[PDB]
Structures are given as structure tokens and as C-alpha cells.
Design a binder for these strands. Structure first.
Ligand SMILES: Nc1nc2c(ncn2[C@@H]2O[C@@H]3COP(=O)(O)O[C@H]4[C@@H](O)[C@H](n5cnc6c(N)ncnc65)O[C@@H]4COP(=O)(O)O[C@@H]2[C@@H]3O)c(=O)[nH]1
Ligand SMILES: [Zn+2]
Length: 355
DNA sequence: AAATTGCCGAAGACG
DNA sequence: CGTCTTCGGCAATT
């Protein structure tokens, strides 16, 4: 049954070819524009991120996430209150970024506005492809493209500051992978740079326009590609596990529920991905994720998610004091609403999987 | 030093 | 299952 759902969720090679060809053409053109010439974003490099490049994209290849990352040396971070995730950026000259300053502080809003303006002008010159820039979203770090290939494809272009220093201390007790992927992996991952994206902290019913947010799309991608306690997990001379399949089933469940209940707008795939990371830490043995145990693994994930929902607590995997299910982010009656919907599908063999 | 190229793992496709 | 194929990612090369 779950097996038949996964077959339905599996992407088609022909759809992947058509979508990728068009997406890569458009992105490459955008990145080229950033490089040339008197652009403040001149040194940006591309990193592909999110569901599709993690191989956990379901149903259709119609959503692509890409980071344009700018190394900016000699920055000092100041934690915006005690959020753990949000920061203000200051500088340790006649530099490319001096006009994005709001006093001594590097403004996320200003920098993102220019970045978006450049993309809009470049997109206007694309004539062989039907692509447009979607309207700006409140507190989004993304410049979102809309492509008609003729099928609809969304591409999020995410500006990110790259910092080569050690990660901010709010992450010190995050990434608890020591009994799973191990201490050498954790240490090496934490020696990689960290990123800030111009997503603003929500302060009441407004946004703080200078704040940036930590991003670990890079570490997350590595983990999804290197997810076993055994090095050969899912390799050609190793054993297939069901970790990713279990994540797909969960994303699907949430996706289907979101399509018909508007009171679930505050929930998203990132909550599901965060939940399963915790599950992978809780159950690190590959033997616990044998494909023969898919049903029980999915049920265990469901139970864990319901418990996060009920206790109003889902710790960011990298920033443990940052609660994705705080009352401030998601109202209590939204969590109770999702709770009842999940229990129903769980007690009725997921009729919603039949669309 | 932008752009090309080699190399192969991940996973879809099909028997 | 095994074998084949395409795509993504990386960095040496020029
Ligand atoms: N592409 C992309 N979109 C993002 C990201 N963060 C947030 N968003 C979209 O930006 C709009 C405002 O974000 P919200 O905080 O209101 O809603 C998000 C956020 O709560 C959380 N979420 C999603 N992704 C993350 C990541 N990567 N880290 C931490 N929290 C995350 O859940 C909601 C998910 O909805 P979303 O598709 O992200 O839409 C957000 C809103 O459009 C981002 O990093 N990358
Ligand atoms: Zn595996």
C-alpha cells in the first residue's frame, strides 16, 4: 500500500529531463548576470539546495531551490534578542556593499531589493522561455521565478552571505549526530562555512528589515545524501534503507492536507524534514530503517510528529533553542487542527493518499 | 581565469 | 533483482 503510494510519488525521468534543461538554462543566465560587471553581487557562487537536489522531491519536478552565495569577509554577528536564528550584520571600505548599510548595519531589505531588481531586469530579457518573477512575499528571502515549460515550475533564488568563521554559539549543541553519523562527520560539517539569508525576523505584525536568518541547506543536503550509520547505506555494494521514502510519505501527507485546509498554511515541509532529522538521531541504526519496516517507520514518525504538535515544541535541528512550533510562530489551534487531521488519516489507513 | 571536461554515485526504467 | 541510462557535483585543466 505505502509501496504503491511511493510508486505514484516517484518522479518520471522524462519530466526530470524537460524540467532540468529549462531550469539550468535560466539559472545559469541569472548567475552570469550577477557576475557582470559593476554588480555588487559579482562573486556569487551557486549551490543547489532543497527537496529536488536532496532526492526527496515528490510527484513532479516543479519546484527548484538555488542559493546564490556571496562570501563577505570580516563580519561580526549580533544575535537579534534571544531567537538563536536571527542576527544583525556589522563590518569589522570603498567596498561593494557600502550602500546597503543602514547606519553601521548591513540591511537585509536593501540588499535583497537590489538583488531582486537585477533578476527582474534579466528575466525581462529572456525571450526563448516563458518565465516571470512572482510578486514579493512578506518575510521571504527568495526571489521566486515562475516558469511555464508549459507545465508550471517555481524556482526560488536565495541570496546568501557566506561566512567562513566558526558557527554562532546558538548552534553549539545543535546537529546531535554523534551516535549516528559520528564525531568526525559533525566536526567536519561544522568546519564548513555557515550562511545568512535575508529572511527578516517577525517582530509582532511587522518585520525587522535589517535582520538575517541562519541557513544550513548545505549541511542538510549533505546529510540527506550521507544518511546511514554504515558508509555503504543505499550504495551499490550496500543495503537500501527506507529513510528517504519515509520522509516522502510524510511530505505527501502534509501536502495533501494543505491542499484542502487553509488553516494549515503555517505548516510546511521544513517542519517535516526537521521532525525526521530528530527521528534519525533517535533511531540511528540502519537496521531500524530496513525497507521491510517502512510501515512502522512511517507510524513512528507520525507518532513523534503528533507529540511535537501536542507539546508545542519542535526544536530546529541546528539551533535547539529555536522552537519552530512556538505559540508565536504557529497558533495553538492550528496545531490542534493538524493533530486531529493526522490522527484521522492514521486511524483510517490514509484515505487522503487516494487523492 | 571563465568555460569545458572527466568521473561516478543516485536513482529511474525495464525486463 | 541486474543492467543501463541521465542528471548533479566537483575540481583539474586550459
Ligand atoms: N525558499 C525559501 N523560502 C523560505 C525560506 N524560509 C521561509 N521561506 C518562505 O518565506 C516566507 C516566509 O517564511 P515563514 O517563516 O513565514 O514560513 C516558513 C518558515 O516558517 C519555515 N521554513 C521554511 N523553510 C525554512 C527553513 N529553511 N528554515 C527555517 N524555517 C523554514 O516554514 C515555513 C515554510 O514555508 P515556506 O515555503 O518556506 O514559505 C516561506 C514564506 O513564503 C527559505 O529558507 N527558503
Ligand atoms: Zn540509506
Amino acid at each position: 500500500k505505502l509501496k504503491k503510494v511511493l510508486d505514484k510519488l516517484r518522479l518520471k525521468r522524462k519530466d526530470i529531463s524537460e524540467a532540468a534543461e529549462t531550469v539550468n538554462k535560466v539559472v545559469e543566465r541569472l548567475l552570469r548576470r550577477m557576475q557582470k560587471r559593476e554588480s555588487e553581487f559579482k562573486g556569487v557562487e551557486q549551490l543547489n539546495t532543497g527537496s529536488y537536489y536532496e532526492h526527496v522531491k515528490i510527484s513532479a519536478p516543479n519546484e527548484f531551490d538555488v542559493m546564490f552565495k556571496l562570501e563577505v569577509p570580516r563580519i561580526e554577528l549580533q544575535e537579534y534578542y534571544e531567537t538563536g536564528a536571527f542576527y544583525l550584520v556589522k563590518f569589522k571600505r570603498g567596498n561593494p556593499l557600502s550602500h546597503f548599510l543602514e547606519g553601521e548595519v548591513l540591511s537585509a531589505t536593501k540588499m535583497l531589493s537590489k538583488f531582486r531588481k537585477i533578476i527582474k531586469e534579466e528575466v525581462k530579457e529572456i525571450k526563448d522561455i516563458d518565465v516571470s518573477v512572482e510578486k514579493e512575499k512578506p518575510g521571504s528571502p527568495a526571489v521566486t521565478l515562475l516558469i511555464r515549460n508549459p507545465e508550471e515550475i517555481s524556482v526560488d533564488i536565495i541570496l546568501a552571505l557566506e561566512s567562513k568563521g566558526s558557527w554562532p554559539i546558538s548552534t553549539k549543541e545543535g546537529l546531535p549526530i554523534q551516535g549516528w553519523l559520528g564525531t568526525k562527520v559533525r566536526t567536519n560539517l561544522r568546519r564548513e562555512p555557515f550562511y545568512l539569508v535575508p529572511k527578516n525576523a517577525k517582530d509582532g505584525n511587522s518585520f525587522q528589515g535589517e535582520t538575517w536568518r541562519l541557513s544550513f541547506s548545505h549541511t542538510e543536503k549533505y546529510i540527506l545524501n550521507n544518511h546511514g550509520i554504515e558508509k555503504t547505506c543505499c550504495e551499490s555494494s550496500g543495503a537500501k534503507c527506507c529513510r528517504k521514502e519515509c520522509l516522502k510519505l510524510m511530505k505527501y501527507l502534509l501536502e495533501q492536507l494543505k491542499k484542502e485546509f487553509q488553516e494549515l498554511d503555517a505548516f510546511c515541509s521544513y517542519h517535516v524534514k526537521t521532525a525526521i532529522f530528530h527521528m534519525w538521531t533517535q533511531d540511528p541504526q540502519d537496521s531500524q530503517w530496513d525497507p521491510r519496516n517502512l510501515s512502522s517507520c512511517f507510524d513512528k514518525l507520525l507518532a513523534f510528529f503528533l507529540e511535537c504538535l501536542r507539546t508545542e515544541k519542535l526544536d530546529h535541528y541546528f539551533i535547539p533553542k529555536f522552537n519552530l512550533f512556538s505559540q508565536e510562530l504557529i497558533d495553538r489551534k492550528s496545531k490542534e487542527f493538524l493533530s486531529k487531521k493526522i490522527e484521522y488519516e492514521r486511524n483510517n489507513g490514509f484515505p487522503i493518499f487516494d487523492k
